[PDB]
């Protein structure tokens, strides 16, 4: 049991509310500049290029203007950037809706495809709307299609067996998510980001993600983008080798991580998705609705009452994580293959 497996095991069994979580960094309380607890790296502010993204562009994808964002770094982890929920009120609902209802559809790929036909999985969303609208409801029901969703891939579909990407397996990357990833990337000083591969993870309360580094992309000089919605997660950021002791931090609804530079190839994991403190409840930021009238040419779309019902009852016991990556260095193709 190395340092990483020790912290992973601990946080997986940790007791919410108690001092077990006292070392976990919480970037959403970092503006209060409370002094760091002994043993914990220091939270430093990271200055963004506030002029690099316009306010109407930021507003197209439901982002506050960059000037309103707070970004932080961690001493000891160069390149790591953490941006507490910079979404305009209600605008997380659109992205959540997209992950549950749109991105999970053919022609993207998801964990259900290996053993379920298109016709079996097509009804995913209607199935979940029907459970909500029934009086007979609750008879020790099997897990819904929505509830059996564990991953979705976009763009270049990551191959879980080979652990490689491939030009032969591609679905065009959704353009709203790509524009969102581009704003975040620019605002962090990475203009020209190519949103080429998406991996979406769907967590239940008992879900985990083990220690790994994301090294399957061909270009390691490019930042990895990570979005979080729903229940909060304990995230462990470690070192280049799998045994260095990691630093715990929270990832709350709307939080964004950007693993650039030296941090790009660090080991990390999520040992725990924490339930809401009152039980099965949304975080407060997800109770704000979308604006009545959306700007012109908005990529954020209106979310129906019936649609948000499904998302809200799902997100009470779940977390959704979107990661966006650039796969190919600019001016490079997947190598062709020799005879
Ligand atoms: O779930 C998270 O917050 C982190 N996810 C990943 O590391 C990943 O998809 O590679
Ligand atoms: Mn990862």
Numbering used by the authors: 20 to 358
Q: Can I see the authors' text?
A:
Mouse ALKBH1 protein has 389 residues and consists of an N-terminal extension (NTE), a nucleotide-recognition lid (NRL), and a C-terminal double-stranded β helix (DSBH) domain. By establishing a reliable in vitro enzymatic assay, we demonstrated that ALKBH1 prefers bubbled and bulged DNAs, instead of ssDNA or dsDNA substrates. Structural studies of ALKBH1 in substrate-free and a 21-mer bulge DNA-bound state revealed the molecular determinants underlying the observed substrate preference, including unique features of a stretch-out Flip1 motif and a functionally indispensable N-terminal “α1” helix.
The DSBH catalytic core of ALKBH1 adopts a typical eight-stranded (I–VIII) jelly-roll fold that contains a major sheet (βI, βVIII, βIII, βVI) and a minor sheet (βVII, βIV, βV and βII) to sandwich Mn(II) and NOG at the active center. The central jelly-roll fold is notably wrapped around and stabilized by additional elements from NTE, NRL and DSBH. In particular, an N-terminal α1 helix of NTE buttresses the minor sheet from the bottom; an extended “coil-sheet” structure of NTE extends the β(V-VI) edge from the back; α3 of NTE and α7 of DSBH organize a helical cluster involving elements α2 and α8, and stack against the major sheet from the top. Moreover, the NRL subdomain composed of elements Flip1 and Flip2 attaches to the β(I) edge of the major sheet, and functionally constitutes the substrate recognition surface along with α1 helix. In contrast, three notably unique structural features to ALKBH1 arise outside the core structure: a far N-terminal α1 helix packed aside the catalytic center, the stretch-out of an extended Flip1, and a long insertion between β(VII) and β(VIII) (INS) that stabilizes Flip1 through helical cluster formation. In contrast, Flip1 of ALKBH1 assumes a fully extended conformation, which is stabilized by extensive hydrophobic and hydrogen-bonding interactions through helical cluster formation among α3 and an “INS” motif, a non-conserved long insertion between β(VII) and β (VIII) unique to ALKBH1. Conceivably, the stretch-out of Flip1 likely leads to the lack of autonomous base-flipping activity of ALKBH1, thus accounting for the observed incompetence of dsDNA demethylation by ALKBH1.
